[PDB]
């Protein structure tokens, strides 16, 4: 029974029932590519992976039997999909198992910035005593009215559109920049479209990232482009760490140029409050890459990924695959 390996994980309890009858299911629990059993490199015909390891062209050249890689998740910046294609390896993602989870987590970050519920929680956990109304206004200082603010979305695909749908009923004006879309989505969903990053940053009170990380948007938010954001803007990133230069953001937060920032993703994961560029930065909310997570979403995506391996093993590659992302290079 062909070997199928989970590269950067242990737990295989959802995937095994779906695959046991067709494949030997194995795990490597690798945190880097040098930690992959040479049995896997020699024998594995299918691989499953999360976001916690990266496969370059040189890494892909080491696999002798591999025919399919399924990313259990939507983002696949961590795989050189062109190299994979040229090498005879199809790459697939699970694009839509966590769209609402991510969008709800994002709206939660934005609300945490405007209303300060997280910081106020932390204040109470540090023993702050808020007796009087002067004390309430003091500890909640900065909380702001949402009606009439502009929410600017960079990327207007699945997560970005989900965020827009939710944001309207709070009284946000929604505006998006997405240079790869055709004309029309803006008219369909009744939001405003701008045509440059600068226009988005200039017009936005709150900016939220919803684009895939690609060859052309590394450090999209940087020292130069942060200066183009409004004074006292909020920044939200529930997309990818590599989109934001953390050195520039640390500085902007410290000078008060950005009023507050909420990151679910970071340039180097796992995030710690005690290390890296944002070491002592005010007005920072972080979560440890959880925007996608819920009981139901995690079950949905692990079944979908296991299903995708099943199709590749019993079907044709890549015609049998539901969500192959490298057909152009295959």
């Amino acid at each position: 029974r062909p070997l199928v390996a989970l590269l950067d994980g242990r737990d295989c309890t959802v995937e095994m029932p779906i695959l046991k009858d067709l494949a030997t299911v194995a795990f490597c629990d690798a945190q880097s590519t040098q930690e992959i059993h040479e049995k896997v490199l020699n024998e594995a015909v299918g691989a499953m992976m999360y976001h916690t390891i990266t496969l370059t062209r040189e890494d892909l050249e080491k696999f002798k039997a591999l025919r399919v890689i399924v990313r259990i998740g939507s983002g696949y910046d961590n795989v050189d999909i062109k190299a994979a294609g040229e090498l005879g390896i199809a790459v697939c993602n699970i694009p839509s198992a966590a769209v609402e989870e991510t969008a709800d987590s994002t709206i939660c970050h934005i609300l945490n910035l405007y209303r300060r519920n997280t910081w106020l929680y932390q204040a109470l956990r540090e023993g702050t005593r808020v007796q009087s109304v002067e004390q309430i206004r003091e500890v909640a200082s900065g909380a702001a009215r949402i009606r009439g603010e502009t929410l600017g979305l960079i990327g207007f695909g699945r997560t970005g559109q989900a965020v827009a749908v939710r944001a309207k009923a709070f009284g946000f004006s929604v505006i998006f920049y997405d240079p790869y879309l055709q004309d029309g989505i803006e008219r369909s969903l009744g939001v405003q479209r701008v045509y440059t990053l600068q226009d988005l940053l200039y017009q936005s009170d709150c900016v939220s990232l919803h684009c895939n990380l690609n060859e052309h948007n590394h450090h999209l938010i940087n020292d130069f482009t942060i200066k183009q954001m409004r004074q006292g803007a909020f920044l939200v990133n529930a997309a990818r760490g590599g989109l934001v230069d953390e050195k520039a953001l640390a500085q902007a937060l410290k000078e008060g140029r950005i009023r507050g920032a909420a990151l679910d993703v970071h340039e180097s994961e796992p995030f710690s409050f005690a290390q890296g560029p944002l070491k002592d930065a005010p007005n920072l909310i972080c979560t440890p890459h959880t925007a996608w997570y819920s009981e139901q979403a995690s079950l949905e995506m692990r079944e979908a990924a296991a299903t995708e391996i099943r199709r590749a093993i019993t079907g044709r590659i890549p015609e049998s695959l539901r969500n192959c992302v490298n057909k152009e290079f295959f």
Partner: peptide, 7 residues
């Protein structure tokens, strides 16, 4: 249980 191939 899956097959332990870790290092």
């Amino acid at each position: 249980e899956a097959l332990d191939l870790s290092m």
